């Protein structure tokens, strides 16, 4: 506060989110006879397809997961219109038309989505879309018929939109009635992932005797850490 | 080798055997958990890295040898002392020592990597020989192949009488004594942190059997207790206690020594398993050895030089498969500074025994004859 | 000398 | 290296691995908090900075002007007292070099480790280091030969990027030694002993005494019955009054032997013998000439030969010739009991000639 | 706490440098009795109008910027820079020609080209938004136009008394400043 000369200034305003760290379990069953006569390493091919499923099942909870027993992604965070942004919510900007980008002028709902973050979170931010949205972004054409993004019809995917990287995360919603199909923000600060650094797999012929019953589990968790560092793009108003 | 077919098919050929179930947990609570298990490894791992080596093939002339050029700097960012302390630091911790070798040129491989034995598992194979080793970080295998002549991993084992494929790791033998020393130290850490001794209690029963004192009385009671009766500056105020009041002084009846003699006895069994003498690391107790010329000589003879002579014996056989000629690496047992009292009485016996000539006692002491 | 420019004292 | 492609993609490519969370909460409570953890680091860091160095691999013992004067601030010994003071505290020593010249860099700066983190990258060795103070990063690069940071690690058996730092191993005994010294500190500051109590029950079961009686009772207690000048006044207790003297039964030694055992298991982890810093207890070593010789052989010369070997490789990336740089283990005053029995051993071996015993001691023959 | 104090001071005086009053706080350049350019006097800042009453001209935008540039004089344009907030540089970047290609930052992948009309751009988040009569874009040479008088010292005081249950950190930087050269700052009113 702007201290006056003889005011006897009084005390001013002095300035916790928990990450429950849930558990992701895989227990594939396999007959013991099979693990001896097959030529393929069924011991290892099951360990390859779990690590693939785990990196893909927690990838979806990171976006549209609820809080219950799984990491809550940023898309379940009581989204509020920008300009009315509060601390407990993620700010979104509207595209105009109710289905897709604005019919009269698209590519404008993106440049004000960029300039809705603040020059401090834009130091390292990146768009996050699924596959069929970057296609709808690339289908954006000006009045002449040329592409706004990746000008020539050759040489697609310029790996930069408005000067910022693009992460094609295929677990976000597509373009729909009110979907937030494009998210932009600094997730290095905005979304914190808490995880245990190992994928434990342990065999046990003991649980079911004629089988092996591989057990595989990992502990991961995470929600938003900075509501000011993630903006979404609602396709409704 | 004739018995190899029935011992390999018993556990299951071609599939990984994971080994011990808690060596990955004993590193967290027995080496980074207590100081005694920490120091006992670091005293041995930094002593076996200190001893020089001898490269000999029938003339011992190889002081410019490529293996001694290899071991002097194994790989970029890990010297000779940092290689063996990381290698012995896997042998004492999980009973298994590993060395990757990368070789662009087919002889004398360029780099030696101490692969950690937490994430390594054997493949018992066909003829009782492990065909593969699987380096499992995350959920990803590697499967080195040893169906060849160079066999890219030497596997240094400690003695294990029950298992066919791993070692015993003296930390695993003292795992009950690590849990006594970790918990009796956390007994005292807890007891200092959540325990209530009062220096006394001021009983106010009142006219009834039970009565609290009024809030005007409670501020008065604290203010004559805070100002006049507490602190070091008020030790002995004669404390007029009127009717109803009473000061019942409390005590703290075990003060010192909460599991103190069962912690030091558990500290010594940690030092007994790895093999250090307790005067070396600094455990208090009875002086078994006398004056550090004995205990440091007993340290390099009971638990260092028996350990280093078989790590270098596996390096003598695994490396020699990379270069035609066979190599023999063994510790020096000369200008190692703790065997000086052994070396004095060798030179004083043969030095004073003047019945034989000078050129005959140079070969007894190990000198070049003249 | 208690005050700055505000007093003139 | 072949296993480099598999451990870095699981740890996370191109990202900063932070590691220990309590790397700075152990410094202010285990180095500025208790004197045993203070002294044991300052004993070693002042000792490893005192042993001189020699330049081998040049074919004759001679960058020695760089180490004796690294920068405008800290001196040769001030550099190693700060370098070893990070390896003993956090297990990680870092060394920035600025090189406007192509070889033999001008300044060496000990980058403190608690504000420093690695990034592994795609393969093998770390690609960069991030010096993060406030919110601001720096992102050094290791994708070249001169590699502006030497990263000295202690041994860590489970982690691939940091050291273990014996303060982390003795983290319980630091908390037992801090709190037991805070037990006695508090107990002298909040504890009521009385020398006694004058109980006034009265005619009833309870009765207070009037303020004309209480000012009288203080005056005859203050003037006549308190002090060193009044020890033993026979204290006529009237009807109803009574003097019940209180005691203070645990007087000495509140957590005294648990603190001294905690004070020695701090010295056990850093490697100092208890005679050097002053821990009371049993006489393990006898006469300090073997206690100092055990110090410079078990925990100083193993520590300095791993730092000086990492200085030997990293500095030899700047000048073309590879340099070796190891502690001298001679003209150090603690190994004199090691040295004189060597000079007495081959010195009295009169069978071999004079040119043959100068070569055993490291003397140039004439 | 020394980090969040130094951050608030660098952010609380940033707003007084632009829209502060004279009372006990630095007078920013926006509170300086703006007068239309061409009729510019010494005691006032000259502004140029954009056309439409809410935003840039509907028929031809991007001209209210180029005549904002050429309203300074070739001596103050030697080193001048635009000053806007975030959601205005976005409205400047949303400017598209008749075909639809964004006059500023040609391709979508472009970013902030950092040189509107050849001059730097300062994204100062304390300037007004695009509104009825806001001067949301200021262009001028502030090296001569705005003088900041300050002391290099935060002068934080740590106070262990008078709040003994607390510690009560105190911190007071001394800073001040208003315009020094009214000819070196031009504004852009969004009125008609």
Numbering used by the authors:
A (entry chain A5): 146 to 160, 164 to 385
B (entry chain A): 24 to 393
C (entry chain C5): 89 to 97
D (entry chain B): 24 to 85, 90 to 393
E (entry chain B5): 194 to 385
Quote the passages of the study that discuss this structure, keeping the authors' original sentences.
Gene transfer agents (GTAs) are DNA-containing phage-like particles produced by some species of bacteria and archaea. The genes encoding proteins that form Rhodobacter capsulatus GTA particles (RcGTA) are derived from phage DNA, which has been integrated into the bacterial genome. Here, we use cryo-electron microscopy (cryo-EM) to determine the structures of RcGTA before and after DNA ejection, and to visualize the interactions of RcGTA with R. capsulatus cells. Particles of RcGTA have heads with a diameter of 38-nm and 49-nm long tails.
The iris has to open to enable genome ejection. Therefore, the release of DNA from the RcGTA particle requires re-arrangement of the baseplate, which is consistent with the observation that one third of empty RcGTA particles lacked baseplates. The central channel of the RcGTA tail above the iris contains a trimer of tape measure proteins and perhaps also one molecule of peptidoglycan peptidase. Some of the empty particles with the baseplate still present contained density corresponding to the inner tail proteins, which would not allow the DNA ejection through the tail. We speculate that the empty particles with attached baseplate are defective and never contained a full complement of DNA.
